[PDB]
Amino acid sequence: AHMSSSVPSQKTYQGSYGFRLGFLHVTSTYSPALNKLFCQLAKTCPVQLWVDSTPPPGTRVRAMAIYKQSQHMTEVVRRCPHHERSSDSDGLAPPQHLIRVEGNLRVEYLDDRNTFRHSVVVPCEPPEVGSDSTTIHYNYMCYSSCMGGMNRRPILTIITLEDSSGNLLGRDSFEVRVSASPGRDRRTEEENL
Ligand SMILES: *C[C@@H](C)C(=O)n1cc(C=O)c2ccccc21
Ligand SMILES: [Zn+2]
């Protein structure tokens, strides 16, 4: 219900370190033609992160969702009230956050004091040598159809690589549809282009 007075950039940017996302070829499936991830509710979505060169120490990877349509872009993407209130609040993620990271005890959940946007950050640990790729496991905690939240509006996930002093090192993004039938919905949306 909260309206921001800003919207993040969605410009794909590999930067100096060659940062970009990839998806491995069901509970989730990625459409290259649509650049769109289709997934089930609260199921693991593996996203591969790639670099061509090792970023400096202290980098972090941030994930944030925004609505894709301009008339909704200022609305903060969050869980619907029913899913927020019904949450066990047993883990690390605050119950209002749409995007969680699974399997990483160093994740931090952010609520921006000025923009009102939620995001989830994974701080990068010094990587073992020659290590050019890693997997982050994201979870989406509402359906795209949740009438009290996203309410059938498409969203984009924006993944940014940021250095320790906050400079943007890279950006990539993909559309998301969370539904009970990701494989069928991907087929349907792909057959309609
Ligand atoms: C999870 C961290 C912050 C990260 O983004 N990351 C770790 C490693 C380890 O080798 C990466 C390799 C390529 C991109 C991002 C990587
Ligand atoms: Zn919901």
Numbering used by the authors: 91 to 115, 122 to 289
Verbatim from the authors:
The transcription factor and tumor suppressor protein p53 is the most frequently mutated and inactivated gene in cancer. Structural characterization of these hotspot mutations revealed a druggable cavity in p53 Y220C, a mutation that indirectly inhibits DNA binding through the loss of thermal stability in the DBD. In this study, we identified the first covalent compounds that selectively react with the somatic cysteine in p53 Y220C to restore thermal stability to WT levels.
To determine the structural mechanism of stabilization by the methacrylamide indole series, we solved cocrystal structures of p53 Y220C-CL in complex with KG6 or KG10 at 1.6 Å and 2.0 Å, respectively. We found that the indole methacrylamide KG6 did not react as efficiently as KG3, with 15% ± 1% labeling compared with 79% ± 1%, respectively. However, the thermal stability was enhanced with a ΔTm of +3.563°C ± 0.002°C for KG6 compared with +1.4°C ± 0.1°C for KG3. This closed conformation of L6 in the p53 Y220C–KG6 complex has not been observed in previous p53 crystal structures. Finally, an allosteric stabilization effect was observed as a result of the L6 movement, where the D228 carbonyl is shifted 2.9 Å, establishing an intramolecular H-bond with the backbone amine of V147 rather than through the small molecule itself. Our structural analysis revealed two conformational states of the covalently modified p53 Y220C, with the KG6-Y220C L6 state representing a novel druggable pocket.
